[PDB]
Amino acid sequence: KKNLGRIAQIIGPVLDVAFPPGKMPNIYNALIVKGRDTAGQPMNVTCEVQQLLGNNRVRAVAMSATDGLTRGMEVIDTGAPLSVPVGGATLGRIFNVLGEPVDNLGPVDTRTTSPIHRSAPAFTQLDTKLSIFETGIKVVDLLAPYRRGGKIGLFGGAGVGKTVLIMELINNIAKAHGGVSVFGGVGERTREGNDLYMEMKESGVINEQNIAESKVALVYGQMNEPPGARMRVGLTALTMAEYFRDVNEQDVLLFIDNIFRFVQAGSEVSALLGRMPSAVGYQPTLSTEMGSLQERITSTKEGSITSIQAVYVPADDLTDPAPATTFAHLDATTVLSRGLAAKGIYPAVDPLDSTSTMLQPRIVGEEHYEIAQRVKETLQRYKELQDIIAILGLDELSEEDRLTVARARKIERFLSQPFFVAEVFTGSPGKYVGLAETIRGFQLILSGELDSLPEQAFYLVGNIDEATAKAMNLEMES
Amino acid sequence: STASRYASALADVADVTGTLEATNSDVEKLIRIFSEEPVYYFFANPVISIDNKRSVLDEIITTSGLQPHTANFINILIDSERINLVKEILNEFEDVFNKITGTEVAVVTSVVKLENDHLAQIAKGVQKITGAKNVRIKTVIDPSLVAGFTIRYGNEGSKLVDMSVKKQLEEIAAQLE
Amino acid sequence: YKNETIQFEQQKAINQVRQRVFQQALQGALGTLNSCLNNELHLRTINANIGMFGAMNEI
Amino acid sequence: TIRADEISKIIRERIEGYNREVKVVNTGTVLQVGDGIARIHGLDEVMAGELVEFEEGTIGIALNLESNNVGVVLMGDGLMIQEGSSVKATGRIAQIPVSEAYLGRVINALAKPIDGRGEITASESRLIESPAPGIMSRRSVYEPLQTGLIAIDAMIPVGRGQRELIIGDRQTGKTAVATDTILNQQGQNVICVYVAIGQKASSVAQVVTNFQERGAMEYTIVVAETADSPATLQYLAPYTGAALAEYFMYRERHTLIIYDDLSKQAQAYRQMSLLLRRPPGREAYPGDVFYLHSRLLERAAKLSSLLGEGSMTALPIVETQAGDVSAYIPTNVISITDGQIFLSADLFNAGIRPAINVGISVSRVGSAAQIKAMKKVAGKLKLELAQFAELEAFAQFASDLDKATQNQLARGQRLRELLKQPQSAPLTVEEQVMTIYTGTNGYLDSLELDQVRKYLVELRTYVKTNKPEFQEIISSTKTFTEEAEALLKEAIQEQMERFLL
Amino acid sequence: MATIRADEISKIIRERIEGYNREVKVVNTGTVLQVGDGIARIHGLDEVMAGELVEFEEGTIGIALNLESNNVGVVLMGDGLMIQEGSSVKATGRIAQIPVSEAYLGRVINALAKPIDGRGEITASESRLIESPAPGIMSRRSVYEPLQTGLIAIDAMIPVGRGQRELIIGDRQTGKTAVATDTILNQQGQNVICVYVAIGQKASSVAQVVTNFQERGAMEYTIVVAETADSPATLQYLAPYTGAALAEYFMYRERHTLIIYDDLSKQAQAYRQMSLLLRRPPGREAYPGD
Amino acid sequence: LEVEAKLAEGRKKIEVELQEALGSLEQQKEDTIKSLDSQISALSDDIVKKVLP
């Protein structure tokens, strides 16, 4: 006899519901309206019981859209956190945030459903190896070595092709990682979500035949999602990923975007909730929420969680409390510039601005971190040089200044390399640029071996040999 | 509302008491008592010594002879200064009475002061339509009711049902359609 | 386009005079319902809308 | 014009069938009205998001089924509406009527006629916020929506079903950028949504005048909200256009929307929740505006062939407030839009409307719907524009520009002349790929580049008369055949003599 | 009492009707009248002294935030999905005690003075008040001592002081904790009790430096105070006082001792969320003044 | 020049003829607004009679 509270008050996806005065449901209890459409009884209001308001009423985060919701409609509360079709049932299934198939595949087996409001992996329980993860992309191999088993994120402004670099990352790492892959389109432009579904099919990461053997799962909440819908979509993605990382104990290749959009959803959700929005637009709840997000994202000992996520780094404000709050909890945030795409670098990461926990001589190899610090300070000197370069120009600069300037200019140009799937905008078939060929290219560039090769020739040139051939084309071009 | 909560608690007190009718009588009597704008101001001014107001309060509790549960309800109420927020909670007590009852007051509004038999038919039909335990009939012989009537029913008078010039509005609509 | 505009003017006057005579007919009906034997026609219609109330009620 | 005759028939014929049907009409005393927001004491039957109607006929959607009143977004103004008037809870939830029948007619935002042609019926009543194009429910935007903007539709390909921002400064004929896209929308079987959201109604009237003299208003529907609207009317007419789009869109046609502009709509929703004192966010927008935009923008798709491959080619104007790319409006606006089309306000100051700052512009599907004609006509042009920017990056140093530097510099300066058009001139995809191969041929280098104005036009004219079969090659076959390129080169040298003449 | 009188209706206004011409005391049990997300407004418990723990009826330590008139706002230390409406939080009376000895040294203590490390309960029999008072100027000597940073530029530029109070402003991955880590390695020979406080850091990285400190054996000299970000901002904001209590146990144990508070800016936002969690008036970046 | 001369002249003449057409339909519909007040009174009886169900 679960409590069918009336729909007490409805404004936004926060609905108030009058439960029984004895039987109020739990905090984060799921619920469901008896529900309707005009077309029959769409009972679809599953709900996240947010705050025990009292007077037998309580405010709650309905996980759907709120039309027709009669004030007084009986919501039988599930009295429990929402459980989702976790596990390999989702492997193949584009799951909705509801756990339903967003694929419009068959309704998945409900044997592995899971409470996404779940505990975090303990410091005892976490794995602790500082293993890096291989990339195939230039600074992605080099500067921020992506750590194996970790929430590597990418903070970027909109229109970065955070989509694009994430998808090229998906293309490389997907074929690369034999670990289970879980992508969370979260507020995504589901045109690109449809692109991603087509691409998983195209890769066999949706092995459509043997849909169980797709071995990469989709969890999509589109841009058109409501915010409480967009709230715990990542929680459900994390729950099925936790089935992969604990139940399956598989290596959790786990990409997700956009967490800043997830924060924006929680912000407007708490704006609905009647709680004072703490930051510029952000909820007070934002802190421990994003901590709980990153905390399930702990690389467990059973399955380490290589969790690539993305921050829609809004307004190019790193000091936006969203990206600020993120910058702690991520392990390795690729900071994607807008500006290097105004320079045309695809990818446009300010590798100066990104940082690795994995960045150490003891970690990366002393050769790697040595040449890396060389290139990094080359960049730093180049950025410092840009100041006097701006008004005055380089004719007032020194010749060692011009030496370093063209040198780090060459470093920046050779940092531009194509990406594998990136052709659909541009046309280039990318090189999966390995770490050591990159190391030799850095060696030639900073060592001034490539200082006879041209800067424009190094632009979107993968290998230093490929740069050498491209320069051979340019030096042939006369 | 918290005023509605005060009303709901007064009704709950009278209901677990059984004095829903009795404190309802007290509610009407005290409503007419607090209807006195001078008494409402004197009880409700902040300048009122709540000592002297409590004196005059027990004096008025005599001066209409209130039932004890509603008396202590008023004591907590004026004690909690929602006497300033008094009267509508009193009014809400009426609906709380109906919330206790299910006797639904529905306002008819007709050209004539209609038949009490027709009133019985409409209250019975609204006891079926409302699904009501009972129906406090709230009649009206409306002037702009051309010939027919208008029964506002429901939780509010939300559930309007009218055939007086309403069909003329429909005819003007279908003309305009 | 001017011909289309002329037919638009035609339809405009069609609805215009339709609404005009609609208002006139309404005024005639208004004086009539005022003039109705009050309790009699109102009781006919009252039991009628009582049965219609019961008709919507079984629905 | 004699409506006097069958009026006795028609008036009684509407009174014939005057059923005046009887359901339980729920209603609210509008307890506290203010700023398009209602405390409606009553309307306890608060089916959420249902449209209800004040006794002044003031429509309103539910904004808060509150525990005391019902808070209602009073759509439009209740400036004549006193407190406590009855709003009949009308039940119908946001269901503005949609059919194809409203076409050729300016709609007032409440689906009333801003045309003034009179009313028109519409059979569907789409709820103004319904679900958006599902993942399976979409397909590839394979088909084009050939924009008619020259190096846009070559370079940044507007696709059938697609989504792309058009960022740009003050009304610059940014209006005319959309309008010249719409002149191309004559030729398709595409429904055009001239959403002039809150624009200058003078200039909007100019737009309609141009549309109707252009006549593609047959192929269009003018969504007209005056600038002095209700801020809710501004804040919801997007959804109205969404429904009217969905009509032809779930009528499987190619369709195309043009919102101008969400920025004023962003100001509106800012003002709306601001009037609610809902605490707004960064740059005083409330947060869900992007979500409102996600309410808006997420509809557009070349839908599934399972759905019927219906294309909804939405593309909005996006007001460049001072070129601030981190306007929270623009910041969101990019984040939804799969294409981003940033205009050239400096070239607008150079008068060079069609003025597109092509580097800062972007579109994901650049050639997946640009034809093999167009792609094999203008990939060279794309890199020619890029290298034109490259040899345009810092050409103020060398002081004798070599034919490498200067010939690429005047070839790309010629390209800067070449994308330029008189406004509202939707050139043919034929003429598009024609000038594309022309610049690819490079032969107009010897034009003192204003010569190319008459030269490319008369070249299109001489291929229009002479080798229109080559236009049939470039369009029917739609692959840059060296037969089509042969006749183009023949007519190119031919008009080269004829413009040498 | 717009909040209280709503949910008073079922019980507490029924109680108010019940006890009107009557002056009573429910002054121990705050039946948890209103409650949201770690913040409660428990009706009653008026004789709960300010700062006390509140033994929530489900079992949770409500931290004493603000005594309103009817109910009181209390900060739940724990996950209060357990507590139902009107749960009689007993006032747990012990006002910010702290199980304090040297017992947690050599253990990664959780914020509850429990070990996060799983090295079992530190048998820390004293109870230093978590909200401790401070060292007076008369109670201060001058810091005559030099402290050994080991960072020769630091001790060159800014003299590390035993007793002293320096703060490291930094950057997103300054890795500034690693500077603290080598300081602890410098402290590993310095006869100083060592504390590695950790507010909201990557618990992965917390374990990384914990392994590095264990391998360093500065974790012999150190306890690790730890409250990662997903825990209560009760714990997150408050935990600095707990480290201070352990430190004052070592410091009223007169030792050279040094603590390393990993960002309290995290704790700043945590108490900012506490202030808005109080639904109080917040200010500059939603901080309170206090 | 002369073709555009006779063409803009055609625009003006078709404008004048359409103006005549519009004013003639204006007088026609105005007369129709005056015409059949008898049919309007037929409606005056009709909607009153059909008014009372």
D185 neighbors D220 (Cβ within 8 angstroms): yes
Minimal CA–CA distance to E19: which of E28, E29, E11, E30? E11
Pairing of strands D37-42, D26-34: antiparallel
Structural tokens at position A271 = 């704006």
Say whether D11 and B175 touch across the interface (CB within 8 A): yes
Q: What does the H/E/C string look like for chain E?
A: CHHHHHHHHHHHHHHHHHCCCCCCCCCCEEEEEEEECCEEEEEECCCCCCCCEEECCCCCEEEEEECCCCEEEEEEECCCCCCCCCCEEEECCCCCCCEECCCCCCCEEECCCCECCCCCCCCCCEECCCCCCCCCCCCCCCCCCCCCCCCHHHHHHCCCCCCCCCCCCCCCCCCHHHHHHHHHHHHHHCCEEEEEEEECCCHHHHHHHHHHHHHHCHHHHEEEEEECCCCCHHHHHHHHHHHHHHHHHHHCCCCEEEEEEECHHHHHHHHHHHHHHCCCCCCHHHCCCC
Helix A435-446 vs helix A399-415: crossing angle, to nearest 10: 160
Question: Cis omega (within 30 of 0) on the bond before A226?
Answer: no
How many other CB atoms sit within 10 Å of the CB of residue D305?
11
Selecting from C20, C25, C45 the residue whose C-beta is nearest the C-beta of F47 gives C25
* Annotated binding-site residue? D175: yes
Residues A445, A408: Cα–Cα separation, whole Å: 8
The minimum CA-CA distance between F1 and chain D, rounded to whole Å, is 19
Q: Phi and psi at residue A92, in whole multiples of 5°?
A: 115, -40
* 3-state SS, residue A388: helix
Minimal CA–CA distance to D92: which of D54, D140, D53? D53
Task: Establish whether chain F is in contact with chain E, requiring a minimum of 3 CB pairs below 8 angstroms.
Answer: no
The minimum CA-CA distance between D44 and chain B, rounded to whole Å, is 6
Residues A331, B114: Cα–Cα separation, whole Å: 79
Which residues on chain C place their C-beta less than 8 Å from a C-beta of chain B? 18-19, 22, 26, 29-30, 33-34, 36, 38-39, 41-43, 45-47, 49-50, 52-54, 56-58
Structural tokens at position D457 = 């036009």
Say whether B147 and C33 touch across the interface (CB within 8 A): yes
Q: Which of D251, D364, D453, D498 is catalytic?
A: D364
Residues D178, D319: Cα–Cα separation, whole Å: 13
DSSP 8-class letter at D356: B
Q: Phi and psi at residue A398, in whole multiples of 5°?
A: -85, 170
Residues A405, F20: Cα–Cα separation, whole Å: 79
Minimal CA–CA distance to D222: which of D235, D231, D232, D203? D203
**Torsional sign, CA D344, D345, D350, D354:** positive
* 3-state SS, residue A203: helix
Structural tokens at position A303 = 């399955």
Question: Cis omega (within 30 of 0) on the bond before D354?
Answer: yes
Neighbors of chain F by Cβ distance (3+ pairs < 8 Å) = B, C, D
DSSP 8-class letter at A246: I
Q: Which residues of A touch E82 (CB under 8 A)?
A: 26
Residues B110, B148: Cα–Cα separation, whole Å: 5
CB-neighbour burial class of residue A342 (10 A; exposed 0-12, middle 13-18, buried 19+): exposed
User: Could you tell me if A13 lies within 8 Å of chain D, comparing CB atoms?
Assistant: no
DSSP 8-class letter at A88: G
User: Could you tell me if B160 lies within 8 Å of chain D, comparing CB atoms?
Assistant: yes
How far is C-alpha D468 from the geometric centre of its chain's CA atoms? 31
Q: Which of A93, A148, A151, A188 is catalytic?
A: A188
DSSP per-residue string spanning A314-383:
GGG-TTSHHHHHHHHH-SEEEEE-SHHHHTT-SS-B-TTT---TT--HHHH-HHHHHHHHHHHHHHHHHH
What domains sit in chain E, N to C, each tagged with a CATH number?
Answer: 25-94 (2.40.30.20), 95-290 (3.40.50.300)
Q: Phi and psi at residue A176, in whole multiples of 5°?
A: -70, -60
Q: How was this structure determined?
A: cryo-EM
C-alpha torsion angle, residues E213, E216, E221, E222 (rounded to 10)? 0
Residues E236, E233: Cα–Cα separation, whole Å: 4
Question: Cis omega (within 30 of 0) on the bond before D260?
Answer: no
Structural tokens at position D24 = 């339980």
Q: Which of B5, B16, B86 to mutate to test the interface with E (most CBs of E within 10 A)?
A: B5
Residues A76, A4: Cα–Cα separation, whole Å: 4
Task: Establish whether chain B is in contact with chain C, requiring a minimum of 3 CB pairs below 8 angstroms.
Answer: yes
Nearest residue in chain C measured CA to CA from F48: C29
How far is C-alpha D411 from the geometric centre of its chain's CA atoms? 33
Task: Establish whether chain C is in contact with chain A, requiring a minimum of 3 CB pairs below 8 angstroms.
Answer: no
A15 neighbors A8 (Cβ within 8 angstroms): yes
Selecting from E13, E18, E20 the residue whose C-beta is nearest the C-beta of B6 gives E13
Residues D298, D129: Cα–Cα separation, whole Å: 11
B6 neighbors B89 (Cβ within 8 angstroms): yes
DSSP per-residue string spanning A51-74:
EEEETTEEEEEESS--TT--TT--
Residues D18, C55: Cα–Cα separation, whole Å: 18
Residues D218, D213: Cα–Cα separation, whole Å: 11
How many other CB atoms sit within 10 Å of the CB of residue A130?
18
Q: In chain B, what are the domain boundaries?
A: 1-102, 103-177
DSSP per-residue string spanning chain B:
-HHHHHHHHHHHHHHHHTTHHHHHHHHHHHHHHHT-HHHHHHHH-TTS-HHHHHHHHHHHHHHTT--HHHHHHHHHHHHTTTTTT-HHHHHHHHHHHHHHH-B--EE--BSS---HHHHHHHHHHHHHHTT-SB--EE--B-SS--SSEEEEESSSS-EEEEESSHHHHHHHHHHH-
Residue D104's Cβ-side half-sphere holds a number of Cα atoms within 13 Å equal to 12
CATH number of D371-499: 1.20.150.20
Say whether D42 and B170 touch across the interface (CB within 8 A): no
Neighbors of chain E by Cβ distance (3+ pairs < 8 Å) = A, B
Pairing of strands A4-10, A75-77: antiparallel
Minimal CA–CA distance to E11: which of A54, A23, B75? A54
Give the architecture-level CATH label for domain D23-92: Beta Barrel (2.40)
- A57 catalytic residue (yes or no): no
Which residues on chain D place their C-beta less than 8 Å from a C-beta of chain B? 11, 14-15, 17-22, 24-29, 41-45, 67-68, 86, 88-89
User: Could you tell me if D1 lies within 8 Å of chain C, comparing CB atoms?
Assistant: yes
Q: Phi and psi at residue D30, in whole multiples of 5°?
A: -75, 100
CA angle, residues D235, D238, D242, in degrees to nearest 5 = 150
Residues A255, E59: Cα–Cα separation, whole Å: 38
Minimal CA–CA distance to A422: which of D141, D364, D138, D302? D364
Minimal CA–CA distance to E162: which of E149, E153, E179? E149
Q: Which of residues 21-60 of B touch D (CB under 8 A)?
A: none
Q: Which residues of F touch D8 (CB under 8 A)?
A: 36, 39-40, 42-43, 46
DSSP per-residue string spanning A152-179:
EEEEE-TTS-HHHHHHHHHHHHHHH--S
Residues D107, D117: Cα–Cα separation, whole Å: 10
Q: Which of residues 13-52 of F touch D (CB under 8 A)?
A: 25, 28-29, 32-33, 35-36, 39-40, 42-43, 46-47, 50-51
Task: Kindly report the CATH class assigned to D93-370.
Answer: alpha beta
Q: Which residues of B touch F52 (CB under 8 A)?
A: 147
Minimal CA–CA distance to E119: which of E219, E236, E10? E219
Say whether D7 and C17 touch across the interface (CB within 8 A): yes
Chain region(s) in chain D for CATH 2.40.30.20: 23-92
What domains sit in chain A, N to C, each tagged with a CATH number?
Answer: 1-81 (2.40.10.170), 82-358 (3.40.50.300), 359-478 (1.10.1140.10)
- What is the resolution of the experimental data for this entry, in Å? 6.5
Residue-wise burial string across D416-436, b where 16 or more C-beta atoms lie within 10 A, e elsewhere = bbbbbbeebebbbbbbbbbbb
E187 neighbors E218 (Cβ within 8 angstroms): yes
Say whether A277 and D279 touch across the interface (CB within 8 A): yes
Q: Which of D37, D41, D65 to mutate to test the interface with A (most CBs of A within 10 A)?
A: D65
Q: Which residues of D touch C11 (CB under 8 A)?
A: 117-118
Q: Which of residues 46-65 of A touch D (CB under 8 A)?
A: 57, 65
Say whether C28 and F21 touch across the interface (CB within 8 A): no
Q: Which of D15, D44, D50 to mutate to test the interface with B (most CBs of B within 10 A)?
A: D44
Residues F53, D20: Cα–Cα separation, whole Å: 10
Minimal CA–CA distance to A165: which of A473, A417, A444? A417
* 3-state SS, residue D52: strand
Rg (CA), chain B: 20
What are the CA-CA distances from residue A320 to residues A231, A325, D334, D335, D458 (Å)? 20, 8, 18, 17, 55
D478 neighbors D460 (Cβ within 8 angstroms): no
**Torsional sign, CA E278, E282, E286, E287:** negative
The minimum CA-CA distance between D86 and chain A, rounded to whole Å, is 19
* 3-state SS, residue D339: strand
Selecting from D15, D24, D43 the residue whose C-beta is nearest the C-beta of B171 gives D15
CB-neighbour burial class of residue E171 (10 A; exposed 0-12, middle 13-18, buried 19+): exposed
Selecting from D22, D117, D212 the residue whose C-beta is nearest the C-beta of C52 gives D22
Chain region(s) in chain D for CATH 1.20.150.20: 371-499
* 3-state SS, residue A13: coil
- A376 catalytic residue (yes or no): no
Residues E108, C58: Cα–Cα separation, whole Å: 72
CA angle, residues A126, A131, A136, in degrees to nearest 5 = 130
Residue numbers in the known binding site of E for ATP are 170-177
Query: How far separated are the first and last CA of chain F, in Å rounded?
Result: 71
Rg (CA), chain D: 26
The minimum CA-CA distance between D484 and chain A, rounded to whole Å, is 25
Residue-wise burial string across A151-173, b where 16 or more C-beta atoms lie within 10 A, e elsewhere = bbbbbbbbbbbbbbbbbbbbbbb
Minimal CA–CA distance to D15: which of F48, A442, E248? F48
The minimum CA-CA distance between B124 and chain F, rounded to whole Å, is 24
